[PDB]
């Protein structure tokens, strides 16, 4: 149940500066007043991050997804290789109530969207649902920037999240905040690309500015400092500058 979108709204793929964002707790070990060196998948400091003002983007190894969303227009994500019934696919949705995680071989068309009538009920993303393996229901995740990290290692899918109010106009703020781990999934898929979902105002769709930022992850070494209470308060890249 979907229609081809004639009004292919343009989201220009701009480039901007990552600064010092993309720091997450790699383990579950308490530490205090210690400098710890660790080699893992991270977002390099002062990298070059893509900005969209929903095409297909490869997953690479990991994804850093940031959104200074207002009124929660972002809906969810689709993960898979071909996003068809021929390959197992994953779906994540976060509406007003409980969030839902689904693992099935759905049927996907060119423009899967949600829409909503102003009566607030509309869902026309996929057409048919095949074999379903994993079901999950949890609590809702949600001037306010939300950052997430998506990883898939050894058949385990890891989602890290962190939200924080903001006051800057457009660019990413030059602050530091670690991304505490949120959710793990014991599902092994060959995911290589992903999508995005929007809450279009079906009232004539009104969705032309979907602002978000996307970066990728590379394996390298960082040095992290733990405060007295065990929260990461500073990080330093290794292969950035001779001083590093």
């Amino acid at each position: 149940q979907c229609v081809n979108l004639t009004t292919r709204t343009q989201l220009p793929p701009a480039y901007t500066n990552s600064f010092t964002r993309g720091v997450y707790y790699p383990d579950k070990v308490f530490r205090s007043s210690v400098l710890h060196s660790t080699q893992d998948l991270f977002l390099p400091f002062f990298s070059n991050v893509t900005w969209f003002h929903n095409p297909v983007l490869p997953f690479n190894d990991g994804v850093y997804f940031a959104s200074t969303e207002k009124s929660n227009i972002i809906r969810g994500w689709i993960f898979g290789t071909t996003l068809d019934s021929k390959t197992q696919s994953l779906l994540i949705v976060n509406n007003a109530t409980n969030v839902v995680i689904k693992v099935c071989e759905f049927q996907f068309c060119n423009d899967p969207f949600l829409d909503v009538y102003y009566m607030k009920s509309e869902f026309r993303v996929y057409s048919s649902a095949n074999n379903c393996t994993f079901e999950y229901v949890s609590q809702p995740f949600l001037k306010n920037l939300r950052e997430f990290v998506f990883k898939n290692i050894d058949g385990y899918f890891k989602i890290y999240s962190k939200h924080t109010p903001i006051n800057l106009v457009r660019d990413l703020p030059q602050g530091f905040s670690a991304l505490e781990p949120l959710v793990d999934l014991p599902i092994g898929i060959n995911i290589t690309r992903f999508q995005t979902l929007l809450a279009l105002h079906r009232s004539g769709w009104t969705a032309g500015a979907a602002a978000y930022y996307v970066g990728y992850l590379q394996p390298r070494t960082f040095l992290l400092k733990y405060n007295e209470n065990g929260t990461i308060t500073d990080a330093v890249d290794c292969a950035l500058d001779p001083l590093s």
């Binding site: 579950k28 070990v29 308490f30 205090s32 505490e180 014991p186 209470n229």
Partner: protein, 366 residues
Amino acid sequence: ETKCTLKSFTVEKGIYQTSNFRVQPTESIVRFPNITNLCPFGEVFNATRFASVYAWNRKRISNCVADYSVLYNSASFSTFKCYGVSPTKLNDLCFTNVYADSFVIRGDEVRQIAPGQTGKIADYNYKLPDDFTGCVIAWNSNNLDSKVGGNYNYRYRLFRKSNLKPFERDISTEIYQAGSTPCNGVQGFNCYFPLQSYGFQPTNGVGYQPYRVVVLSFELLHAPATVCGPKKSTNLVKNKCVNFNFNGLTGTGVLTESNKKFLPFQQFGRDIADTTDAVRDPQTLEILDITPCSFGGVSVITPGTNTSNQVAVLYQGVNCTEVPVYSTGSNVFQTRAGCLIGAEHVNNSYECDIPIGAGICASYQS
């Protein structure tokens, strides 16, 4: 011990180091989370209706805490026979993707369910692989699945083009030709329905009354495991040198209360020269503290076997609280170097001949 270590029958005056003192563990503690995700087992063994042998009911169970001790002890099961696994260790086996094939058959075909087994329903209704692993559970259903009017709704496949592959469901409803002429869906000569009805009746003897049989199958290390036997937990101790297995993290030490404040997502803490120091119990969710049990070296002070025959014993860097013939002995002294047994502490002062440490030393007089 001094004479043996020095490899002599005579010893000169002085202090000599000897074997090590180590406190032994007293008992054990095992702690695991209170979580008990009950597995959906009642509905598959207590169901009123079971699918037929040709249409065997296939059920998939995942993400559950599966307990088989509550089912092994059941005596209502006519047959409890597991092939690749001994029934006693099933509670200690970790698997996932549980498959259950349940059906109702006659009493004379109960033996037909086995790896590499030949028969009628074994190759025409449901087939098990030669390398089949898991278990088979069978019981009599004459009280329920048998009626005075006869349960003829149950059909078993009798005619087929060939045999059935392992894990194959054949529910095709088509006439079978037993001659050299077409049937065209007519039950004429050499044209019979491959499925035959069951004549289950209470008056029937053994081999004829209905029997409910279900086979359970598992996977062997292909995907992350989620259906595994329950893990038992033990009580908790305090201020006693024990050994612990906190959520799979094992170690020997003594546990006290800690004022450290973790963050709501860690499980344990470590320090410089990485070693576990504090842990959070999976049930109460409280931050404890771990410190190692007392240990040290012991030494002997002697004035030389040529002069006297009595010795004094010094325990290095050990509190004068856990000392244990030289457990009480004589008066005991506590010093900055440890504890001293067999010597009298005097309040005079002389020159030092046999050093002890921390500005004190001993000599012969006693």
